[PDB]
């Protein structure tokens, strides 16, 4: 008996994503995690989008 995910995982665009998609035709998934790790000086994200 195996435990499997009951439903699909939902990906959502953030407001920062909306701005970059309107202006640059480009989306960086989970923008805020990158910006916080970038200004804090942390070289590694904990997880992938």
């Amino acid at each position: 008996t195996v435990s499997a995910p009951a439903t699909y995982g939902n990906f959502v665009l953030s407001p920062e994503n909306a701005v970059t998609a309107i202006s640059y035709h480009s989306i960086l998934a989970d923008f805020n995690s990158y910006k916080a790790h970038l200004t804090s000086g942390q070289p590694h994200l904990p997880n992938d989008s």
Partner: protein, 49 residues
């Protein structure tokens, strides 16, 4: 992004309505000035009379 497009559509309808209202005011001024200038004789005519 869908919300952005809905609000953009409502705002473009608003802009069109406002521009048309101002155009109607300008057109009324233009037409009145036009008829007023139509019925006005020149200086030499009126001073002679």
């Amino acid at each position: 992004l869908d919300k952005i497009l809905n609000v953009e559509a409502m705002h473009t309808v608003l802009r069109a309505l406002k521009n048309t209202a101002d155009a109607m005011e300008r057109g009324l001024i233009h037409s009145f000035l036009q008829t007023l200038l139509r019925k006005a004789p020149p200086y030499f005519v009126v001073q002679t009379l």
